Amino acid sequence: RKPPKGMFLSQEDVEAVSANATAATTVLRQLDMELVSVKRQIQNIKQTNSALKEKLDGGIEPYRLPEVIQKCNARWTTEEQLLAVQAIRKYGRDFQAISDVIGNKSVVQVKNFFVNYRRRFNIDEVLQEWEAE
């Protein structure tokens, strides 16, 4: 019913090795080369990737800044307000960035800000111009 397991005999396979006298020796060169071809393209990209691996020498570690583990407050200091209004002009709705810029305002205090103050800080005008951009 089925070939002895480990033997590959497909209907399609068979007609290709019997289509003529050397259709056997044909098919096993367009494979034999096929390989040498992919084998080449390996050592190429294995090299392209060896040079890219060395440009990343050092990694990003003469470039890190330590952690601002600053405790999340409640009041909107007249300073923190102003950092916010620019945070919107530069960041729009990313509510995460705004809350990392101000540092001591949870993302949700950033909502109340967006609404409580809006009009007084024209958060509409400010936001629409972030979109031009």
Binding site: Q11, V14, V27, Q41, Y63, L65, Q86, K90, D100, V101
Partner: protein, 666 residues
């Protein structure tokens, strides 16, 4: 099996069905009631059982009805009919028995038998057993034909048939009780030895071998499951398919190397696009950090815009620093996936030189127990006789298989050194024309009612004809002769003065330099008590080692033995015998194979007896004058002694039916 049923199987008949032959003799029973069939079927089995349980004396009808018990020893013609049918077609009282009823007073009808080979002798005995004038014509100075034993001093070695496929339903089992043969078993263990001189280690021995049995089935799947059976309007040979299977394997070894190194690239090229994304983040980060530094050099107190600049560039540089960490977290997982795929690299080869050279020896063994290059065996039919093989360990005859033809020949009119030269058969009889082999001038004419021809298929194949048929053999029979396979394999007999081989080892191989000489001296037997090693030569090689002197051949043998047992430990042979079966004009080969284009059904034509045209035109259609038996004639047991023997018993049973009449069918 065992019982009444044990006989039925040891006699090659199904204990619970009427056979197509028995239907034709007892067509009252088989058309009638299930009861009577079972009655009959016991009486058959029961009588078979008696003959088998004592095959050294004839089983008279009286003796049988005696040991029958009712309701079966009730109908004393159903017992008669059964017995006579059995006795007629050699299912009982065949071989060598003491005859309780000594031979008939006067002979009836005259039969000339061409060939005292085994089939000949077996029918001659059965015909003379039935009271006919049987005389056998033999071109040789000995009986047996293909059963040749060499004897010099204490040395004994068959150049002929040697093995006895197991006595599980073998008529030879019956014979061996009747003739004192020394049946030793064949201890199947065979160590192989490459052209160096050293054994192939179990390791390979078994993984080659299994790949070889695996390739075979694969062809059988090509044949029966896919119908790979014609290749540009020629039929497909076994050796053909055995390479379109070996190629499809070498091919898939490559398809699989390919789609694995193709897994590597498809991921190594993901690394190429992650390393590029990483280096262009180390560039954005290298530069933000510079910006952020510049924004902190502003010495405070600063206004809010230049304070939002620090706080901003800080989140921007922490955001990019997060990206670049993730994107070398991912560089982590891929960079090891890729020693992963370089550490399960699928197989380098299908087979090595050392590999498909040992496999070449496992092909030279097919070329031995088929006697032909696998490129000529029919794919669909090569093995068609397998379904019928006798259950038992194969055996060897230690006193020489020739003990069995000689035993049969006894009591028979045998004209030795008599080359039959022309068979003439007509509406009213036949005459056979022979010469004396020694002075070929001296001519012999033999007249008879029927000629049984056991001429080896190789002889029948000769162009131009060793034996002329008058009238010619009809096309349906001549074409069945061309289509069928006749093959070759030869034996070299090495007689020494001391065993220098492993004496518990019956046989040991030798692997071949080439593909093209997988046959040449590919296997050795220590089968005999004496120091006699016996060297097979099958395959394509057999046919060409007949063009090489006996010396050159013993040389090639000793060399192959020196390498395997030590340049010094292998003396000279005292006596050497090189067979030449394709040479030998009374055989023109060794036995039949099923050629590509033959089926097993040519083997059945081979037997259809020949009926000549009417003498006086518009006469009654005559009684059939020319008959055939021999190894080539028996579909289900070709190329064997038991098979020839069986064909002899057969034709005798049919000739007797033709000329003595068939009383057992009312």
């Amino acid at each position: 099996p065992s019982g009444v049923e044990g006989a039925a199987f040891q006699s090659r008949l199904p204990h619970d069905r009427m056979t197509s032959q028995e239907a034709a003799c007892f067509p009252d029973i088989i058309s009638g009631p299930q009861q009577t069939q079972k009655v009959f079927l016991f009486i058959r089995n029961r009588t078979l059982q008696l003959w088998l349980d004592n095959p050294k004396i004839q089983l008279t009808f009286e003796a049988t009805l005696q040991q029958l018990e009712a309701p079966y020893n009730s109908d004393t013609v159903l017992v008669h009919r059964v017995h006579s049918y059995l006795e007629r077609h050699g299912l009982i009282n065949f071989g060598i028995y003491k005859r309780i009823k000594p031979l008939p007073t006067k002979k009836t009808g005259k039969v000339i038998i061409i060939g005292s080979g085994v089939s000949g002798l077996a029918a001659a005995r059965q015909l003379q057993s039935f009271g006919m004038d049987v005389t056998l014509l033999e071109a040789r100075d000995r009986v047996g034909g293909r059963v040749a034993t060499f004897r010099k001093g204490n040395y004994v070695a068959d150049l002929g048939a040697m093995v006895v496929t197991g006595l599980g339903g073998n008529p030879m089992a019956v014979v061996s009780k009747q003739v004192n043969m020394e049946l030793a078993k064949i201890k199947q263990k065979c160590p192989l030895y490459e052209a160096n001189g050293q054994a192939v280690p179990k390791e390979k021995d078994e993984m080659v071998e299994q790949e070889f049995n695996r390739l075979l089935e694969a062809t059988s799947y090509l044949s029966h499951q896919l119908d790979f059976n014609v290749l540009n309007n020629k039929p497909v040979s076994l050796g053909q398919a055995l390479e379109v299977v070996i190629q499809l394997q070498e091919k898939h070894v490559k398809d699989e190397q390919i789609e694995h190194w193709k897994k590597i690239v498809k991921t190594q090229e993901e690394l190429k696009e992650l390393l590029n994304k990483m280096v262009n983040l180390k560039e954005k980060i290298k530069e933000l950090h510079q910006q952020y530094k510049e924004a902190s050099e502003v010495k405070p107190p600063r206004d809010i815009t230049a304070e939002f600049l620090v706080k901003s560039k800080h989140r921007d540089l922490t955001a990019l620093c997060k990206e670049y960490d993730e994107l070398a977290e991912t560089q982590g997982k891929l960079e090891e996936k890729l020693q992963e795929l370089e550490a399960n690299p699928p197989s380098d080869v299908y087979l090595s030189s050392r590999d498909r050279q040992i496999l070449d020896w496992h092909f030279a063994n097919l070329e031995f127990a088929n006697a032909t290059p696998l490129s000529t065996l029919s794919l669909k039919h090569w093995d068609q006789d397998d379904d019928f093989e006798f259950t038992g360990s194969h055996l060897t005859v230690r006193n020489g298989y020739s003990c069995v033809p000689v035993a049969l020949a006894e009591g028979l009119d045998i004209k030795l050194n008599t080359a039959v030269r022309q068979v003439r058969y007509t509406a009213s009889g036949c005459e056979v024309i022979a010469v004396n082999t020694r002075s070929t001038s001296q001519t012999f004419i033999y007249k008879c009612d029927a000629v049984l021809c056991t001429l080896p298929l190789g002889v029948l194949k000769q162009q131009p004809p060793a034996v002329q048929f008058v009238p010619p053999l009809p096309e349906w029979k001549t074409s069945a002769v061309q289509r069928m396979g006749f093959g070759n394999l030869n034996k070299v007999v090495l007689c020494f003065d001391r065993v220098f081989w492993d004496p518990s080892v019956n046989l040991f191989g030798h692997v071949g330099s080439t593909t093209a000489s997988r046959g040449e001296l590919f296997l050795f037997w220590n089968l005999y008590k004496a120091p006699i090693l016996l060297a097979l030569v099958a395959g394509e090689a057999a046919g060409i080692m007949e063009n090489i002197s006996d010396d050159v051949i013993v040389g090639r043998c000793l060399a192959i033995l020196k390498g395997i047992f030590g340049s010094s430990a292998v003396p000279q042979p005292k006596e050497t015998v090189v067979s030449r079966w394709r040479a030998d004009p009374w055989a023109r080969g060794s036995y039949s194979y099923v050629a590509a284009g033959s089926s097993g059904n040519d083997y059945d034509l081979m037997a259809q007896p020949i009926t000549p045209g009417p003498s006086i035109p518009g006469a009654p259609q005559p009684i059939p004058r020319l008959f055939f038996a021999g190894e080539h004639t028996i579909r289900n047991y070709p190329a064997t002694v038991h098979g020839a023997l069986l064909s002899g018993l057969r034709e005798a049973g049919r000739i007797a039916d033709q000329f003595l009449g068939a009383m057992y069918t009312l």
